Each structure stands twice: as C-alpha cells, then as structure tokens.
Amino acid sequence: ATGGYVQQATGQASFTMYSGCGSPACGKAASGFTAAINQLAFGSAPGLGAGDACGRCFALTGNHDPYSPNYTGPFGQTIVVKVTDLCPVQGDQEFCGQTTSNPTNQHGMPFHFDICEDTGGSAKFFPSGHGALTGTFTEVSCSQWSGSDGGQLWNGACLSGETAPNWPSTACGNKGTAPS
Ligand SMILES: CC(CCO)CCO
C-alpha cells in the first residue's frame, strides 16, 4: 500500500493481549472488542496519528500455541475486533517487529494483533493459561462487530475504516513510510 505498508485483507498472524486501550493511536477508542495491529500493517508511526488500519474490522482465529507446542486444543472462539491501536516496531520486537526488509516476526508471522483485555475480547479468544497464539485473520464488514465508537481524543482522530470496503482501499489513509 501507499508508504510501503503491507495491508492485506487476510493472512496469518500471531496474537497476544494487552491492557489499557482507552487512549489508542487512532485517537478514538471503542466499547466493543478492539485490537492493536503491528506497525507495518497499521499504516503510521508513533506520533503521526491514524493509519489506514484504523476502524477496520477483522475476524481472528487462533489455532496454535507456539509456547506450548504439545497443546492440541481447545482454542478460544473466533472473535471480530475493530482496530483502534498501533503495536509499534520499537515497542515490541518479538511480535510487532515486521519491517519491509524483514516482514515476519520471531514466530514467522507477517501480522500481529494485540487484543485489548479491557473490553472483554481476550477472555473470549485465549484459553486460560495460553496468552500467545498464532492463527489467521480475515477482514469482514463491521456489521459483524458489536459496540460503539468513543469520542475523538485529538484532532485528526479517525476510525473511518469502519465503513470502508476491504483492502485494497483507502479510508483514514497511511502516514509516512513503513519501517525498513
Ligand atoms: C509492500 C512492501 C513490501 C514489504 O516487503 C513495500 C515494498 O518495499
């Protein structure tokens, strides 16, 4: 995509959970299940505001625990998340360090979703005692997402991906250049 970001409607991903998503990088939070996505797919860098992932909705499915390779299941439910936040290259190397020159992380996955614990999404997705998974995602209509958007935290906030057709397409738009 513009800026060299890697933005595809379906693919393989790793998954973790995090706390505190009330002031996210897209500049609006949301009351439903939300996630952060790795910088190379988010479409922006820290401090530059919303990128084109902002507001898009994705169905997530986990099917392996790389830290418990003997574990056969069961895994959690498929959930639909809205992306509101950025998982930056500098902040999390193991999971979100994909760059244009090295587009997979330490688990071989080209994408990563960090699922926000606050609003309930991680409790549906991760079985107890398994806080990191790999699996797949697919972009879906936000008709499949439940919740409502919060108010803008600053000018330029954007979740307009929530009404956009699936990638490839442009809604909030990418900022700057993807990490090399
Ligand atoms: C679409 C990107 C490729 C990532 O390897 C930008 C090309 O540099």
Side-chain angles (χ1 to χ4, degrees), residues 14-21 34-36 87 92 95 112-118 120-133:
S14 46
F15 305 103
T16 51
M17 67 180 87
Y18 78 111
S19 289
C21 57
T34 57
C87 187
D92 184 341
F95 291 105
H112 184 80
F113 289 79
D114 210 354
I115 296 166
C116 190
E117 191 276 344
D118 310 359
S122 59
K124 296 276 180 179
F125 188 82
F126 296 96
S128 198
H130 301 267
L133 301 176

Side-chain angles (χ1 to χ4, degrees), residues 12-13 15 61-66 71-73 75-76 125 133-136:
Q12 292 184 70
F15 305 103
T61 302
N63 61 18
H64 181 55
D65 180 349
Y71 184 75
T72 77
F75 292 98
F125 188 82
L133 301 176
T134 61
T136 61

Side-chain angles (χ1 to χ4, degrees), residues 94-140:
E94 178 178 355
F95 291 105
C96 293
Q98 303 90 337
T99 63
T100 54
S101 71
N102 183 9
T104 59
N105 62 20
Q106 285 185 18
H107 302 275
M109 301 285 128
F111 297 91
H112 184 80
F113 289 79
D114 210 354
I115 296 166
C116 190
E117 191 276 344
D118 310 359
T119 49
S122 59
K124 296 276 180 179
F125 188 82
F126 296 96
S128 198
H130 301 267
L133 301 176
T134 61
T136 61
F137 67 95
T138 186
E139 197 176 354
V140 296

